Design a protein that fits this description.
The structure is cut from a larger assembly and holds nine protein chains of nine kinds.
Chain D lengths: L3 E5 L4 E6 L2 E3 L2 E4 L5 E5 L2 E7 L3 H20 L5 H15 L8 E9 L4 E7 L5 E3 L2 E4 L3 H11 L6 H18 L7 E7 L2 E4 L7
Helix pairs in contact in D: 3-4
Chain G lengths: L18 H10 L5 E6 L2 E7 L16 E3 L4 E7 L1 H22 L5 H17 L8 E9 L3 E7 L5 E3 L2 E4 L3 H11 L6 H15 L10 E8 L6 E5 L2 H10 L4
Antiparallel strand pairs in G: 1-2, 1-8, 2-9, 3-4, 4-5, 5-6, 6-7, 9-10
Chain I lengths: L17 H12 L3 E6 L2 E7 L7 E2 L7 E4 L2 E7 L1 H23 L5 H14 L11 E9 L3 E7 L5 E3 L2 E4 L3 H11 L6 H12 L12 E6 L20 E3 L2 H9 L2
Helix pairs in contact in I: 2-3
Classes of the chains: A alpha+beta (111), B alpha+beta (242), C alpha+beta (233), D alpha+beta (198), E alpha+beta (243), F alpha+beta (244), G alpha+beta (244), H alpha+beta (241), I alpha+beta (249).
Amino acid sequence: QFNPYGDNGGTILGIAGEDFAVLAGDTRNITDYSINSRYEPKVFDCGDNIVMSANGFAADGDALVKRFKNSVKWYHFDHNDKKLSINSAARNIQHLLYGKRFFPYYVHTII
Amino acid sequence: DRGVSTFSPEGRLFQVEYSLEAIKLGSTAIGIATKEGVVLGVEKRATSPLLESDSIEKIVEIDRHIGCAMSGLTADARSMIEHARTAAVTHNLYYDEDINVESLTQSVCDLALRFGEGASGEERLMSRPFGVALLIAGHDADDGYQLFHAEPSGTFYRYNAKAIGSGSEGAQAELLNEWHSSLTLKEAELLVLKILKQVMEEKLDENNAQLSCITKQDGFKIYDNEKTAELIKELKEKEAAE
Amino acid sequence: FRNNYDGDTVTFSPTGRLFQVEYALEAIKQGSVTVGLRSNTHAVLVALKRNADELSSYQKKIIKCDEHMGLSLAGLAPDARVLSNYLRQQCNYSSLVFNRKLAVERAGHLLCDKAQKNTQSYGGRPYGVGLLIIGYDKSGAHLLEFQPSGNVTELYGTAIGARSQGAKTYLERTLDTFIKIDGNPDELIKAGVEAISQSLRDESLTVDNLSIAIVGKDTPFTIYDGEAVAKYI
Amino acid sequence: MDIILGIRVQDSVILASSKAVTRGISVLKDSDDKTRQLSPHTLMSFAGEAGDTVQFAEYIQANIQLYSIREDYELSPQAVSSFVRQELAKSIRSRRPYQVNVLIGGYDKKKNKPELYQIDYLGTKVELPYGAHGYSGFYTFSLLDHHYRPDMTTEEGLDLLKLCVQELEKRMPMDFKGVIVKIVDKDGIRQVDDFQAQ
Amino acid sequence: AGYDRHITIFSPEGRLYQVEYAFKATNQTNINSLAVRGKDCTVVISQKKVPDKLLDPTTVSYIFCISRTIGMVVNGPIPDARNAALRAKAEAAEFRYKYGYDMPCDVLAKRMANLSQIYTQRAYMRPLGVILTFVSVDEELGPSIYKTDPAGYYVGYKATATGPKQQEITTNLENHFKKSKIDHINEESWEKVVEFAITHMIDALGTEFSKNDLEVGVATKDKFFTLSAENIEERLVAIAEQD
Amino acid sequence: GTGYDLSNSVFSPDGRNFQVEYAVKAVENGTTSIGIKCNDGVVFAVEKLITSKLLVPQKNVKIQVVDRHIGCVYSGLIPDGRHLVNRGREEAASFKKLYKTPIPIPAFADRLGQYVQAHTLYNSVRPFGVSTIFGGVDKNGAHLYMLEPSGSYWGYKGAATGKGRQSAKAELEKLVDHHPEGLSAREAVKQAAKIIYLAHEDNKEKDFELEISWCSLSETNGLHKFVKGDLLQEAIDFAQKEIN
Amino acid sequence: GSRRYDSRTTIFSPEGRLYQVEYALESISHAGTAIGIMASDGIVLAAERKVTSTLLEQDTSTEKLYKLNDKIAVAVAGLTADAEILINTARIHAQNYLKTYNEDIPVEILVRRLSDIKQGYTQHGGLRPFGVSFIYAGYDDRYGYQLYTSNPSGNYTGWKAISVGANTSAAQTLLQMDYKDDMKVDDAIELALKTLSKTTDSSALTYDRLEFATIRKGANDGEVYQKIFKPQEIKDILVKTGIT
Amino acid sequence: GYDRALSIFSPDGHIFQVEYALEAVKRGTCAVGVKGKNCVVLGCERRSTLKLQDTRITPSKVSKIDSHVVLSFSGLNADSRILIEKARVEAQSHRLTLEDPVTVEYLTRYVAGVQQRYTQSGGVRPFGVSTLIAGFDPRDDEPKLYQTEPSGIYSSWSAQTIGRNSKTVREFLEKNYDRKEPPATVEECVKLTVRSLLEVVQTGAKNIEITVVKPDSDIVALSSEEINQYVTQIEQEKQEQ
Amino acid sequence: TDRYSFSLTTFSPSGKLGQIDYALTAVKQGVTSLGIKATNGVVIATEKKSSSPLAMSETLSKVSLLTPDIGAVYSGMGPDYRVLVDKSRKVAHTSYKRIYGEYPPTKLLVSEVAKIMQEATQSGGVRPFGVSLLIAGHDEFNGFSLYQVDPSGSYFPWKATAIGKGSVAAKTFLEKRWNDELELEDAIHIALLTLKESVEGEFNGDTIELAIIGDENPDLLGYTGIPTDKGPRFRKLTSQEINDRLEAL
């Protein structure tokens, strides 16, 4: 039977400082025992001074990052160019993920 | 007959204009914004002395930072308030923050055009426009204390001060002269009372008039009947002088 | 006369006219004035905003659609919201599904087809707003004029709203002067402000009254308001 | 499962129901009233699946209380039981059937007679002198088969329940934390508060 | 006191004016058509009027091949005519799929007649301004002619005619069958039957014909076909040698 | 009493649908447009009224393509024409999906035929305010069609509609008479340019822009393409030389 | 669209009445008369057929008296067709109640249901009301013998004696003159015939123009019995009172 | 289905269908309600165009919504049943989800909302009914009286009337009812109710029905004789003066 | 897209239902048809009004079999009748034969036909049927019966009746001649005599359609083998069979 999930490897890491915050991730993308790409960027600038990464199944990870980027865009349209505070982004991403509670995104996600 | 959403040769929507005439028959509502807070005031207009005047709720809370005053067919505003409240709380659930006074209004006005009798585009089921105007007043971090007027057409203008209802053109003439950029909240309190006293059919007191405001600090608050009476007493004594 | 024929949209007149569509076009004519123009490098929107009081706000006439595109309105403000918000979705669909900035010419074709449907089916009314759309895509600068009848036309410059005939006369004369303002934003805005004054007639244009939008080669669609337009007065 | 018992005497119906609610390895409550009052003279006790149990009872309660107001009248126990049966018999072939067993104990004011109905989750209704749901019946039925008489007073009926509860406290693995006992007679419904150490 | 003539509802006299005005519409194309039965064939004849020199004459046609076996001629505006054609073609194909034999001529007539009755009774559907003449050599009933109108009426015919000058063709055809004392055209070949149909058309219209003035469809055992301008020309040369 | 012209699907006592006739009035009110069928294809052309010097040249294209082999041009209410081509494109895509072959021209004609006709059957829709000229090359030759607001259509040797339909129809008739064997695609392009320039006499108050497209088996391989550059200018030059 | 032809059945007159309801009541006033009379020991239903021929069959015919239940029957005044639709939904409702509760439906509950269905066509839907008025005769163990009336406005009330259809004003005066609470069924039958006899639009009152029904409690059985009077039974009950 | 907008605006800002709905309320029989210190009393009139009815089985004009709140109406009887049923259901639904019976304010607000909905939905006319809703909030000893109308507006009254000649009886209540002191007794509260009805009703043995609601679900309907005693006394009050 | 969801038949101030009244006027213009009930059968007859001498009136059946024991004839609008015959035949299967395994009794099928005609009297966007039907039938527990069905949806049982063009004069002719002891052969004789007054043109087996509901026909069943299947009680008389009776007239 068809299995909709996969594991594309990788590892991400986030650390906050006093006035800064870093989000790291290896550029490697794999399937089983094969390397797909040695350079496939995994951490993205989403605008409003927010960086995001969704590690696990890259197909679910790209869908989510694409959906959050688009959410930021519409937040600007609907609320007169107001900045999306990082606390508001988190809550927004919670809703994005929980929307697929019964057919989940296989990602561990950091912002 | 002839269609509901139809254009006059003058280029206006019949039903919307007729609805505007229904708002003129409504009880007066007056908003004023300052840098200490926006203030709302309404005329109760009890049709019989047996009417328990405090059951006339023409001022409502949408959220701790957003209030609302009505005028016209007040029954129509029940679902409008419902949708204003929901949207405000849903925005909070979705973004862990307060909805913008601006974005809150825009959402209410989206309902305003949702009438018709046929299908082309996105489906909207409502038979007639609303027969009620709204004043929407509140505060946000971005644009401070704000006062909006939301008409059944779908448009909303931001106002420094606005009157709606029966004696609105008389009130608007007075508000034009009396408003400046550096009014204190108490000066805007007496103003609402003065302009109401003038355009009301009845002798204004704590029973046929209600006061409300909104500060950043204390949120949105409806004034109790004992507090309002003190300001009217304060007003009468200041009229006595000059 | 029209009586009996102005009925509703799905009715033709004996002469071959659609009066409901015509009455919609009339709502534009009584809306506030707004002007458009372009060279090869930039496209410029200039709208005069209309208040209801000196205690009211000058209600906004310029709406952003995508990073490279946007429009100005004249007539019913709710209807402009419906149409711009439709254009936002079509702009977004092209970005997401194809990774392609939606062409300005194709944007016009979609608004045309949307408006057309409201003029052929019973129950629905025509849109009561005219639109000026500026954009910069893969084929340079563009300006389009939208009519609620569905009629879309690409132009070098144009005007709609109250008293718009002065601006359209002036622009027709200025054709060879503005089309060659390449690589200079201000001098296309300057030409826009001089166009909008030909339709003034009544009042002096002020700091909290003028609206300006620009898009082009190295410039994303951005709107200027308040003290930011002070220099063009 | 929990203990749901019922016995019809001369002039009343007595319902005894276990006080325990257990989830996994913990007894969470020992004062659980496993009954609903459907009308002034009709009571229903219920046991079964965790959520379904109360939800169904309150759904029935509301429906009978709605009837009472609409007609300014109280339905007979027979009527009420026939309603409850139909409700269960519907759900049994639905996407997610109710998993609740019930006892209906009423007093027909029109007939001046007590009535006891046993209805299981499938919608099998049957009128009985005495009834039990779950594993309880495996002990009580034969005990009552022996000690039951149809002409007993309400006082004798309580003695007969006590003999069942003592039996179940001796031979069943679950500690069901005692019973709450309720009487349904001509004067309505009341609770025997001192059953614990009677 | 007005709207009973705009939609298909009864008037005080018990009439449906929309249906009546639809009959009027059938004569708008100003074309006459007729149909006749042979010994083992059925022929439809229709006038062909091409007023424009810019038109492609080979597309100007009011005869339709509904199936391998059924042919239909239409009096009335073409948009309605092609509406009825497509429906009939669809209905014939669907019949075959469901019932495993070809739809008989008289059944397709009934089905179309029933469909018209509906626009007669339901307000949102307008009647079609057309009269449909179905012809075939049915495998059970032999050569067959069946005709439906905007009223939802239909019946079989020994022969038929339709158009502005319908009455002149009908009484002409009746007079032939009184003298012959039989209900068909006693001839083996369909060629002579087509020749008969044109001859008795001219006689009742008083107007001569050339190859581009007419249109001829023929129904035989297991086939219905329409003649080319050249087959009609061949047929016209035969009748000229007769007189 | 009357009033048989107030609602779409209503017959008047003379058997007519007055709302459809009123639609024609919007067509006659429109810009003139033509079609010529040649010995291996079809040519399409349309007038474009230059209302202002502010109209960008070669940009407000009125001729539309269906699939890859059919071209359509219309007179009257432009937005209605577009809606009809959108339907056409869907109808063509539907055909080239069930059946592998690209949609035949007679086939495509009827598809528009039935759709337009459908808008004369109910009072809840309006008829189309366009006459449409369309055609192309298929499995057996070239085809040209013209479709009225009633849903009526026929095959044509030459077709014309709009403000200058009179002048055009007369010009075309001389071509049918004088060239019985057939006009060539190359010649029909030049000729079409003359017909538009001569049909402009009716609308001669404002200046115009010529637009020609063609579909030819041996000149475009049977695919609808526009006429640009050298051949477009050559055609204007030919029209200007026979207008003097 | 259709706006032009819409009667707007469910709206108010400037007065506050419902046009269609009022006109449906006017329709009923021309229908055959029906009468219900409640005695202490039963109920009587009687109906006048209106216009009838000699060649009309009366054997199979029961056009005005309908059995809803073992314990409830109705008299119909108005359109028979409209009435049968309502009778049939009411026959169903009774069986639903019996399936659900294992008890026969109380009379008012069935009456309220039918009155709500009638009220429906009065507030929404755009359809005409039912041109029907009902007299209900029935028994339940709550109120015993009950007699109800319901009209197109969806309104119902309870009666000791009542009439619907033609000449109700005249019939109501004659019943209000001769009714008393301690009546026996056989006295009520007599009253029913006597009333109809004076308000007939006919020359004389004959059996073939009449329909009769009683709802008694068996004076030996101890339970409720329904009786639809056969042609001969009416013929007999007519001689007893001396009308022949 | 059928969604024709029947409630629409007219040139001078009136919804004529809502307006005409009130005209049906004027036609309907009279209804009154006065609130004492510890009670609410509802009074209604019975017509007498035809008198040969059965009063036991014919629905009495005051309906019970829940065991603590009652509803009376003026207008079209058939419409009122639809409103009553809906309010009775919502009453049960509230007990189910909030675990507490409805307040009088809430139950009124719901009914008012239903009516308002019917004034801007397609294919429906507004209700030809105004209601008087009366009762006590759970665990509360303070009287509640509310009025709704076809427009969907609602408000609470010290005293109110609706229906035919409500103008005349409202006139009576405006000069008689004291806000300083309401009727302190349950007995003297009923007196004021019958008095106000006797203006419009005529000397009525029937014609007048009274229902008295006290706190904690104590609702009782008065008999013919109990009412008759008030009728016998009230008309003897005038003759002494 | 049908927006006609409102009634086209409504009440006028006088209480008339306009459209039903007008439907009855249409039936009045329609050709005369009749029904007569005998002790051992029923007979229904009408005139085949020729629309053209060229037309084949055999292909036009004014009489129809509904169930093997139930027949129908009409006056008024032919199209309306035809679709009603189709619906009635189907409803006899879907509402009765598929549930109970036998054909519906005459009163119930009539009841179902009436029901269909009622709906057109009330449903959104439709006009009533412009026909009156005469339905003759037989069922084990009711014997032979005859009902008239009107545009309103009302039905009445008749011993004998006529509808349409010359109903008034025909009803009067039947009253004079009908008794409760008539045999079937006699009922046919009367039927032909009544119809001769309505026909001005040709009166023969070809211009008259006539059917009966009588004894069971074993030769018309199509098969032998089931003793409890004895065949249809409905029979249409051939052109030849009518002419035989007209020679002794």
